[PDB]
Amino acid sequence: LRNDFYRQLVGKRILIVVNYDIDAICASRILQALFKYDHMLYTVVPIMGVTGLKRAYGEHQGDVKYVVLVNCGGCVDIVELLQPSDDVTFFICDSHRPLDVCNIYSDRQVCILGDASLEENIPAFETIFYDSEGEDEDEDESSDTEQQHDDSGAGESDQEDQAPRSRKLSRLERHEQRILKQRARRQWESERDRIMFEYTQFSYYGRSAALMVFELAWKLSKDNMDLLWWAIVGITEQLLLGKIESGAYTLELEQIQSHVSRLTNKTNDQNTMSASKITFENDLHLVLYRHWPVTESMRYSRYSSCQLKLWTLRGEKRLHELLLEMGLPLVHARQTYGAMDLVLRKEFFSMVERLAEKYDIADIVYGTFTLSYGYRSRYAAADYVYALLAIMESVKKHKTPEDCFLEASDALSRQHKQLLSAGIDQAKLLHAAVFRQVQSSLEARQVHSAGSFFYYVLQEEHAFFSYPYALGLLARFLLRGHVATSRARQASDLPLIASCPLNASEGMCLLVGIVPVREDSPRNFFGKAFEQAAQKSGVALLQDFFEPAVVQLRQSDLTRFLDSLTV
Amino acid sequence: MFGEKAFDLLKELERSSQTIPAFDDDGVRQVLEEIKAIFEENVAQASSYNASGDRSLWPLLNFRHAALQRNKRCLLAYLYERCRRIKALRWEFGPIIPGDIKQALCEPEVTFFNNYSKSLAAYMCSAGYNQGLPIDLTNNLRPPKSLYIEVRCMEDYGKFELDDGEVIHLKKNSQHYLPRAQVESLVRQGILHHI
């Protein structure tokens, strides 16, 4: 709730919107709007990393009490992170959910939006910080330390039969005067079975970043159509239930339509140009039905391709055979779908949905929205987001990271669109440059298993694959690629790694972790899994991202680290 | 070139539009070597019996005259537009944030810069209030809004923000202890088309 706490929000603030994300911008531009509405000046921020965050707060060494960060938080007992915080108001709203408890407790400078059907970690603080063994926060028999310290009367207090609290059992000795430590460790470790179940085996994401924010601003009587679209963007990023889960899809078909359909501000007069209120339809995650012909865009998506195996010829043969049953002309299969004639381009999906039921594909259609600004053309559900990811354009000017962020947030207006087509173009060329490596690497047989996983390494830098989003995308097209056709049915289920050269950064051999096949809810080990070898030998590793599934190494200090990381 | 160079003289300001690196005191030295190069001839025939008063000189008076006309009034423009541009950007800010350089002062423009600033100061004193409220006219157009926060910018140079801060680093990410009276000068001389 903040139908009460929002009424705190008038004084000065800082609105930080942590490292690059589509949840980020969609969730934050609305609040920029909200906050120049009630006549507040504030601060939006680019985040380059947790160090970027810490210097940022360092540069804002004031007493801005209404500090705000969003889509982060699980890093420390962040009073340890952020010492000078005294009673300063922070707000966490992150869906990176497996977060510390010291950030949850200490009801001082934090917002426990603790609301979940998992009441599983209640004494998770009641024994690690509250108990201790072989400790110094205590007294001694001598008269020089005759003062009572922060006596928790627990293992946090002494273990020499000095514990006024801890009134479950005997006092002097259970079997010995220090069986205190024995039972302390019993509970400690027997329930580190569940502490190590947290944060040291697996990570995930939770819920939205900004649909809660839509309901917040909905209670103040705003029917901002565009805010529905921006939140739609925020979700349709990791609506990708194979990437990171939505789940609620068939429940949000009630939720969001109920937000928007039932309140019909015009039921009879809406046949107008500007922003004719949003609609909903059941369509695909075929990449880019609209502005391209079929036959290139039927070819660069993984799911349409992997099930029909087109990077070899034979897939094209069966492809043509299904265009045959579809009876699309090849010319028409090479003019833009919109550039087609009428009747075919109307009936296209109408036929494809039902007579693809019978030929190896079942999971291409979705439920989404689309709308006009005017009479130019009818933009698409995600063709923003696949234009966005192409704006992470790590050029060597050193300004372009933050500048491309600022550009991106200045994109989803109804105004700036000469760039949006730019994003489309950039996206397409990268999208088929993805495919351009798979044939090279598959049929060169670069699929290094090397034991319990599959593994890739690469050799030099591409501007595609300088940054790691494209890298995860590489790994997540090859994987299906190889494991369709080179295997029996036994070994299709193992995880994957991939090197990522950075000729820019003096030689670091970046990596990204990614998971085996077809287990949507059973997600990453790699919330910590890499860190094993970090303990065993341990060499210059990083975990800088609030994204977990990533590292950054030296050019060449990986292989032995990998041999340790065999297990 | 025979009375044309001012086309070159304000060409000092050729790049200085609003992408200005800096400025200088061009186009005076050899050209005002003229004014004393010539009075000799212009007054060579001065009260002379060299012609005992006839028609002959009658251009030469005018030669002097037009020479001077061109000279003085070229010069009038040469300071006048400088007053104009500096006045514009000084309508974007007070003398809090002075000129880019304060080295393109052609010496008598001591008088001129200070004179213009303080003639206007006098008029200010009359204006605003009868005692005189130098009254905010062209910057800090926040309606009643926050007082003490810093913001994002677009890469200023000049480094003239003395106001109330230890160092606010008046550029992009001039982001420090910024109060309101700290940030009281610049709106469109090149910073915050974007917070």
Q: Which of A43, A67, A397, A400 is the best substitution to test chain B (most B C-beta atoms within 10 A)?
A: A43
CA–CA separation, A330 and A324 (whole Å): 10
Looking at the complex, report in whole angstroms how far the Cα of residue A413 sits from the nearest Cα belonging to chain B: 15
DSSP lists the bridge partners of residue A499 as A511
Put simply, whether B195 touches A (Cβ < 8 Å) is yes
A62·B143 Cβ contact <8 A: no
CA–CA separation, A277 and A127 (whole Å): 54
CA–CA separation, A394 and A404 (whole Å): 9
Q: Which of B141, B147, B148, B149 is the best substitution to test chain A (most A C-beta atoms within 10 A)?
A: B149
Among candidates B143, B149, B176 on the partner chain, residue whose Cβ is nearest the Cβ of A12: B149
Among candidates B142, B151, B175 on the partner chain, residue whose Cβ is nearest the Cβ of A59: B175
A60·B175 Cβ contact <8 A: yes
Q: Name the strand (E) or helix (H) holding A372.
A: strand A371-372
Put simply, whether A32 touches B (Cβ < 8 Å) is no
> Which residues in chain B are closer than 8 Å to A406, comparing Cβ atoms?
194
A59·B173 Cβ contact <8 A: yes
The neighbour count for residue A461, using CB atoms within 10 Å, is 14
CA–CA separation, A50 and A447 (whole Å): 34
Q: Name the strand (E) or helix (H) holding A54.
A: helix A50-59
Among candidates B144, B177, B194 on the partner chain, residue whose Cβ is nearest the Cβ of A62: B177
> Which residues in chain B are closer than 8 Å to A14, comparing Cβ atoms?
149
Cα nearest neighbour of B168 on chain A: A59
Q: Which of A60, A398, A403, A409 is the best substitution to test chain B (most B C-beta atoms within 10 A)?
A: A60
Contact A17, A27 (CB under 8 A): yes
Structure tokens at A269: 């007069």
Q: Which of B146, B150, B187 is the best substitution to test chain A (most A C-beta atoms within 10 A)?
A: B146
Structure tokens at A203: 């990570």
Structure tokens at B93: 């800010």
Contact A371, A351 (CB under 8 A): no
Looking at the complex, report in whole angstroms how far the Cα of residue A61 sits from the nearest Cα belonging to chain B: 7
Pair type for strands A44-45 and A13-17: parallel
Block residue for tokens 């800096």: B22
CA–CA separation, B53 and A141 (whole Å): 127
B152·A43 Cβ contact <8 A: yes
CA–CA separation, A66 and A15 (whole Å): 9
Question: What phi and psi, each to the nearest 5 degrees, are found at residue A163?
Answer: -155, 85
Put simply, whether B102 touches A (Cβ < 8 Å) is no
> Which residues in chain B are closer than 8 Å to A41, comparing Cβ atoms?
142, 145-146, 149, 151, 195
Q: Name the strand (E) or helix (H) holding B122.
A: helix B109-126
Put simply, whether B142 touches A (Cβ < 8 Å) is yes
**What single-letter amino acid sits at A457?**
V
Look at residue A316 and give its three-state secondary structure: helix
CA–CA separation, B184 and B170 (whole Å): 12
- Return the DSSP state at A130: T
CA–CA separation, A115 and A95 (whole Å): 12
Look at residue A14 and give its three-state secondary structure: strand
B149·A39 Cβ contact <8 A: no
DSSP lists the bridge partners of residue B40 as none
B177·A12 Cβ contact <8 A: no
Structure tokens at A82: 């952020």
CA–CA separation, A43 and A61 (whole Å): 14
Cα nearest neighbour of A9 on chain B: B146
394-413 in chain A: CB under 8 A from chain B: 406
DSSP lists the bridge partners of residue A379 as A371
**What single-letter amino acid sits at A20?**
Y
Q: Which of A12, A32, A37, A41 is the best substitution to test chain B (most B C-beta atoms within 10 A)?
A: A41
Put simply, whether B63 touches A (Cβ < 8 Å) is no
CB contacts < 8 A (A, B): 39
Look at residue A485 and give its three-state secondary structure: coil
Where would I find the H helices in A328-451? Answer: 343-352, 385-388, 400-409, 418-443
Look at residue B84 and give its three-state secondary structure: helix
- Return the DSSP state at A550: E
Distance from the Cα of residue A430 to its chain's centroid: 21
B149·A61 Cβ contact <8 A: no
The neighbour count for residue A310, using CB atoms within 10 Å, is 19
Structure tokens at A439: 């044939």
Q: Technique behind this structure?
A: cryo-EM
CA distances from A395 to A401, A508, B90, B116 (A): 8, 18, 37, 47
CA–CA separation, A279 and A371 (whole Å): 7
CA–CA separation, A223 and A66 (whole Å): 27
Cα nearest neighbour of A58 on chain B: B176
> Which residues in chain A are closer than 8 Å to B194, comparing Cβ atoms?
406
This structure's resolution (angstroms)? Answer: 4.0
Pair type for strands A66-70 and A13-17: parallel
Describe the strand order of the beta sheet including A499-500 as a list of residue ranges. Answer: A499-500, A510-512, A550-551
CA distances from A74 to A106, A220, A551 (A): 15, 31, 17
* Region class of A455: left (phi > 0), else alpha (psi between -120 and 50), else beta: beta
Put simply, whether A420 touches B (Cβ < 8 Å) is no
DSSP lists the bridge partners of residue A512 as A550
